[PDB]
Design a protein around this ligand. Structure first.
Ligand SMILES: O=C(O)CN(CC(=O)O)[C@H](Cc1ccc(NC(=S)NC(CO)(CO)CO)cc1)CN(CC(=O)O)[C@H]1CCCC[C@@H]1N(CC(=O)O)CC(=O)O
Ligand SMILES: [Y+3]
Length: 172
């Protein structure tokens, strides 16, 4: 594990528009401070649906292709006073999770987004950054910008992964 960065190093998308951020996003890139993992099984891409609710929170559902079937997980992001920042609803329901924070760093809403996550699980602090795309593939310039932002946070190139687009489940 590499140290979580001070929030002052993590920008917040100016004038965040929650109703433009809703809908389907693909995780085209991700970088975390965690385990690094050896595996001759390539990482498959996942999709996330940000469902904006009446209480202004998002029910975020991710889906992955696993054991020949589709596997879903939904988490509720509760808005803070600063637009684009969130905390986790019903944290007691997640075994081991004691702190959780979300910050939308940047997005143009119709193509891409970069989201920062910081959490404490079983007394260890983890953080990650994801590159979301409206499509499964994004321009090399957006991926390089994501790579340099991840680096700016102290993450080495080998912690950065661009999951392989697949057809199963995520075209949901
Ligand atoms: O985020 C993705 O798109 C791929 N993720 C992996 C990754 O980031 O490397 C998982 C993928 C994922 C899919 C299905 C199951 N389903 C299970 S646990 N299902 C049973 C377990 O049997 C529990 O409900 C059964 O239903 C678990 C894992 C989904 N993640 C949760 C995770 O990483 O644990 C997302 C879940 C929805 C909220 C946003 C969240 N992450 C968004 C992000 O990283 O950009 C932030 C975060 O991870 O804190
Ligand atoms: Y995730």
């Amino acid at each position: 594990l590499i140290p979580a960065p001070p929030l002052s190093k993590v920008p917040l998308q100016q004038n965040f528009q929650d109703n433009q951020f809703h809908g389907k996003w693909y995780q085209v890139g991700r970088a975390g401070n965690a385990a690094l993992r050896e595996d001759k099984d390539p990482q498959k891409m996942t999709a996330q649906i940000y469902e904006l609710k009446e209480d202004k929170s998002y029910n975020v559902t991710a889906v992955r292709f696993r054991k020949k079937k589709c596997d879903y997980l939904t988490m509720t992001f509760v808005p803070g006073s600063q637009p684009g920042e969130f905390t986790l609803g019903n944290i007691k329901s997640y075994p081991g999770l004691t702190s959780y924070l979300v910050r939308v760093v940047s997005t143009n809403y119709n193509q891409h987004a970069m989201v920062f996550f910081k959490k404490v699980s079983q007394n260890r602090e983890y953080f990650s950054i994801t590159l979301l795309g409206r499509t499964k593939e994004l321009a090399s310039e957006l991926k390089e910008n994501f790579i340099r932002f991840s680096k700016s946070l102290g993450l080495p190139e080998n912690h950065i992964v661009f999951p392989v687009p697949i057809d199963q489940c995520i075209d949901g």
